[PDB]
Amino acid sequence: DINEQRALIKSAHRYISEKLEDHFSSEFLPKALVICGEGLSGISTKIADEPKPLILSYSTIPGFKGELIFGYMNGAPVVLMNLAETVHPIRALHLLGSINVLIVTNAAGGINASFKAGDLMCVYDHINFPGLCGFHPLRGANFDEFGPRFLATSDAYDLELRKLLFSKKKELNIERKIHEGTYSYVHGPTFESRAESRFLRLAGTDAVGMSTVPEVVTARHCGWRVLALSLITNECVVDPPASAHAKASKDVQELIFSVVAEI
Amino acid sequence: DINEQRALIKSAHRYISEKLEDHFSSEFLPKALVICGEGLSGISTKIADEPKPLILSYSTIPGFKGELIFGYMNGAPVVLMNGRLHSYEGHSLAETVHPIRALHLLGSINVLIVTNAAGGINASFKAGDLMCVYDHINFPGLCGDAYDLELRKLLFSKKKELNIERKIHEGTYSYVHGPTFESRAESRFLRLAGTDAVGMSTVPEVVTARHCGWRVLALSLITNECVVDPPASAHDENPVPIQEGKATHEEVLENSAKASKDVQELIFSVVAEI
Amino acid sequence: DINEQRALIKSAHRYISEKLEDHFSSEFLPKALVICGEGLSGISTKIADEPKPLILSYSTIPGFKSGELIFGYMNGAPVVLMNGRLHSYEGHSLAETVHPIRALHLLGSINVLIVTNAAGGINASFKAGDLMCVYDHINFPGLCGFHPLRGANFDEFGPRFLATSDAYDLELRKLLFSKKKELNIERKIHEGTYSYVHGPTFESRAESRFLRLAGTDAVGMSTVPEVVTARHCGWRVLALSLITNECVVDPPASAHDENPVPIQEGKATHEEVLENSAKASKDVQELIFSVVAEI
Numbered sequence: 001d002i003n004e005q006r007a008l009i010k011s012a013h014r015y016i017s018e019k020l021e022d023h024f025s026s027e028f029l030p031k032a033l034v035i036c037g038e039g040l041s042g043i044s045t046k047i048a049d050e051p052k053p054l055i056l057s058y059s060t061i062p063g064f065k066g067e068l069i070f071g072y073m074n075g076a077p078v079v080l081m082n083l084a085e086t087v088h089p090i091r092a093l094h095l096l097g098s099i100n101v102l103i104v105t106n107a108a109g110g111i112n113a114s115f116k117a118g119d120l121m122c123v124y125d126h127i128n129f130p131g132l133c134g135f136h137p138l139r140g141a142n143f144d145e146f147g148p149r150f151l152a153t154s155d156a157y158d159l160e161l162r163k164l165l166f167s168k169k170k171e172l173n174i175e176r177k178i179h180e181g182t183y184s185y186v187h188g189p190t191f192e193s194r195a196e197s198r199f200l201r202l203a204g205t206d207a208v209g210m211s212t213v214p215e216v217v218t219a220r221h222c223g224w225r226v227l228a229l230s231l232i233t234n235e236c237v238v239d240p241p242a243s244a245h246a247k248a249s250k251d252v253q254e255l256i257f258s259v260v261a262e263i
Numbered sequence: 264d265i266n267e268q269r270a271l272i273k274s275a276h277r278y279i280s281e282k283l284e285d286h287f288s289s290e291f292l293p294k295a296l297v298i299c300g301e302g303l304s305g306i307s308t309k310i311a312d313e314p315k316p317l318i319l320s321y322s323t324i325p326g327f328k329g330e331l332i333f334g335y336m337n338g339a340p341v342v343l344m345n346g347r348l349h350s351y352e353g354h355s356l357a358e359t360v361h362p363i364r365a366l367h368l369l370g371s372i373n374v375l376i377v378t379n380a381a382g383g384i385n386a387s388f389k390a391g392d393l394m395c396v397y398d399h400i401n402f403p404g405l406c407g408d409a410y411d412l413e414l415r416k417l418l419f420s421k422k423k424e425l426n427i428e429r430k431i432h433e434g435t436y437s438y439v440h441g442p443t444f445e446s447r448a449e450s451r452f453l454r455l456a457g458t459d460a461v462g463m464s465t466v467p468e469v470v471t472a473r474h475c476g477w478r479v480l481a482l483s484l485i486t487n488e489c490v491v492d493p494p495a496s497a498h499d500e501n502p503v504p505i506q507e508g509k510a511t512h513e514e515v516l517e518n519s520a521k522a523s524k525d526v527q528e529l530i531f532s533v534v535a536e537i
Numbered sequence: 538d539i540n541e542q543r544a545l546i547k548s549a550h551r552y553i554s555e556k557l558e559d560h561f562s563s564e565f566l567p568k569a570l571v572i573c574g575e576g577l578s579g580i581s582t583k584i585a586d587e588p589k590p591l592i593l594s595y596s597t598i599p600g601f602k603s604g605e606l607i608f609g610y611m612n613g614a615p616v617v618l619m620n621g622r623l624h625s626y627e628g629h630s631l632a633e634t635v636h637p638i639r640a641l642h643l644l645g646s647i648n649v650l651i652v653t654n655a656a657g658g659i660n661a662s663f664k665a666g667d668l669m670c671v672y673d674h675i676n677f678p679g680l681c682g683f684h685p686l687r688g689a690n691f692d693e694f695g696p697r698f699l700a701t702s703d704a705y706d707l708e709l710r711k712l713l714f715s716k717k718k719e720l721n722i723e724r725k726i727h728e729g730t731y732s733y734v735h736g737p738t739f740e741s742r743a744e745s746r747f748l749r750l751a752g753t754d755a756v757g758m759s760t761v762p763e764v765v766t767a768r769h770c771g772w773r774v775l776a777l778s779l780i781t782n783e784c785v786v787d788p789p790a791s792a793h794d795e796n797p798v799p800i801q802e803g804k805a806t807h808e809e810v811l812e813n814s815a816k817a818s819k820d821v822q823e824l825i826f827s828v829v830a831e832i
């Protein structure tokens with residue numbers, strides 16, 4: 001089972017390595033992988049027209065099940081992504097020997113009382129609720145060539161990358177609020193109850209969603225640095241029920257566009 | 264797979280719709296489904312003996328893994344689900360909610376009335392109280408407006424009109440997988456999470472009923488107070504035995520049966536104004 | 538499937554029952570199952586060389602998914618040792634990880650489970666090197682559907698619905714502290730609540746903070762599914778955790794911190810767990826050696 005998993009990752013890398021060589025005149029060794037969140041696929045527009053970026057549909061990459069975009073962004077070579085199957089790409093791209101940072105954005109509901117729709121949250125910690133229970137990207141035989149059997153997550157979110165994100169906001173004069181908080185991963189509907197939202201808040205949750213965390217864990221297992229940004233799309237209602245008696249994408253675009261330059 | 268799953272739902276509806284036409288001279292279009300939990304099978308007697316009710320066994324209905332009772336209750340056409348399926352039995356969440364989807368294809372049901380036993384997490388609850396659910400926590404669903412306010416006002420008005428002295432709390436129901444009863448720390452955790460009562464059922468049916476567009480009224484029978492005190496320490500010279508006050512299935516059964524009569528009358532009054 | 542599980546259970550029992558009769562001139566009726574954590578394999582040394590102990594590899598036992606069962610006498614008492622355990626993060630089902638308990642139960646002699654593990658310290662007063670006698674647990678994955686009793690009930694072993702507020706026998710814990718005093722062991726043995734999480738990641742800061750407010754004193758990746766299964770069989774349970782590290786719970790350094798603490802500082806490692814488990818192993822082996830003689 002892991003053997004077929006291994007070959008599918010090698011097959012996917014073999015394909016991507018070949019197309020890169022055939023496409024780019026210079027050896028394209030991307031320093032970053034950018035996971036464009038829900039409604040943040042415009043980031044591909046900030047890719048440079050010269051050299052001509054390479055676009056690979058997932059349909060043509062072995063093992064994959066969406067497109068991969070290999071180009072330059074503010075001068076830096078990057079990859080764009082527009083449970084072991086959702087993290088098969090990170091392992092495949094890792095075999096290029098060049099990526100050392102994952103930048104992942106997402107939409108997230110606000111659980112911290114001080115958050116409002118439109119605010120941003122720079123993720124500096126997470127709660128992987130399915131991972132605690134048995135829905136884990138690392139469950140099963142360990143990929144020894146990639147990382148250790150037991151991986152620490154208390155160092156998941158690189159401090160220097162977050163300090164860089166905040167400097168690029170002040171430089172870009174972006175007024176939008178950006179917080180620093182914990183992101184809770186639930187495999188549960190945004191249709192969370194008010195009691196569920198309340199439990200999450202007291203559980204130590206600042207923003208909540210259904211993404212990012214499995215990719216963060218897989219990247220950290222591969223040794224990459226991780227920078228994670230959340231767009232607070234709504235404020236989760238946490239009050240008890242009645243008793244019977246589109247602009248922020250631009251800011252996220254420019255913030256990343258600046259950050260990738262100094263990676 | 265969803266296609267072969269959709270065929271079973273359609274197959275179940277075709278079966279049930281066929282039997283209703285054969286059995287009832289007049290068209291039978293039930294307005295509410297009543298899922299009877301632990302010890303609420305006495306509601307079957309509140310079904311009018313005329314017109315003669317139709318009884319369908321699960322083994323005979325396609326897709327079902329207990330019996331369906333179709334009849335009139337306080338003048339209203341209803342379906343009784345005698346015997347529910349539980350996730351702790353190994354079944355998938357889809358199998359446990361397939362009956363709701365099959366019955367939804369009749370186009371007439373618009374209310375789910377569901378009861379179940381529950382352990383009391385709210386410290387002021389006692390065995391014998393009921394809890395009108397107005398919110399829930401779906402623990403298996405997450406880490407792995409739903410309760411119609413007017414039906415809740417209807418329930419309390421029917422308690423006052425029937426002069427039922429039994430307490431009826433309003434609070435949050437926590438759905439956990441079971442089949443273990445909670446350890447002391449788990450209950451203390453559920454309490455600080457905002458739990459009022461905890462059970463091993465109901466929330467999947469509620470979520471499926473809301474998906475079908477049904478109004479939902481959920482009533483929890485508090486059969487026991489969850490043990491929350493830390494256990495006896497090995498340094499205690501006068502320790503409370505760790506077995507003291509432990510939950511049992513027998514306690515759940517007995518306390519459910521004692522509250523059945525009040526619950527049956529409460530539902531009997533509710534369906535008439537549904 | 539339960540019928541497939543039963544045949545597997547009876548098949549493993551018939552296998553073990555046979556090799557017990559061929560090997561031991563006397564009838565070998567073990568009274569306790571000892572599950573040895575990682576780094577606690579030294580307990581196999583306290584098994585007497587006479588009568589000759591029997592060793593069955595998991596590879597040969599049907600159902601058992603290198604790990605081995607050691608059948609012998611410890612402090613004169615007949616015991617069975619689970620040298621190495623199965624973990625859910627390896628890809629096994631909880632039913633597979635606790636299948637050995639069911640098979641051994643069919644010998645009709647074991648009424649005590651002694652289970653050891655390593656654990657990170659969530660209780661802030663804990664330190665690496667301390668022991669924690671378990672007197673309660675939090676089975677959060679069980680609350681969320683990952684439960685060893687999920688599926689059709691083994692009606693020949695125990696009830697469909699099982700209380701866990703009485704999971705950790707009181708006399709067995711008093712006996713453990715009695716043996717600590719009797720042996721002049723100076724190591725700290727706390728009493729507290731163990732929390733089972735799936736792994737294989739070590740906890741994030743926020744995850745550990747969630748465990749603390751939830752009532753956790755020590756967090757590990759094993760034990761509870763075996764304890765639940767042993768209780769379902771009607772066994773008494775003594776569980777001993779080894780505090781191998783102090784979970785990092787402080788929030789990570791903020792971007793606005795002028796003098797930030799390195800986020801890697803204090804990070805848990807597997808080397809740290811193995812090495813601290815190895816240092817406290819002798820005390821643990823001798824505690825268990827004394828206890829098995831009085832169950």
Ligand SMILES: Nc1nc2c(CN3C[C@H](CO)[C@@H](O)C3)c[nH]c2c(=O)[nH]1
Pocket residue numbers: 301379380381382383439441443444445461462463464486487489510511512515698
């Ligand atoms: N989790 C939980 N459920 C219940 C229930 C609900 N049902 C009680 C019945 C027998 O245990 C199962 O169908 C679950 C009553 N008391 C409790 C309790 O203390 N805890």
Ligand SMILES: Nc1nc2c(CN3C[C@H](CO)[C@@H](O)C3)c[nH]c2c(=O)[nH]1
Pocket residue numbers: 150575654655656657658734736738739740756757758781782784805806807810811
């Ligand atoms: N979850 C968790 N488990 C452990 C354990 C128990 N196991 C011991 C082994 C060492 O990495 C892993 O399987 C975890 C020791 N320390 C910790 C900790 O901090 N956390």
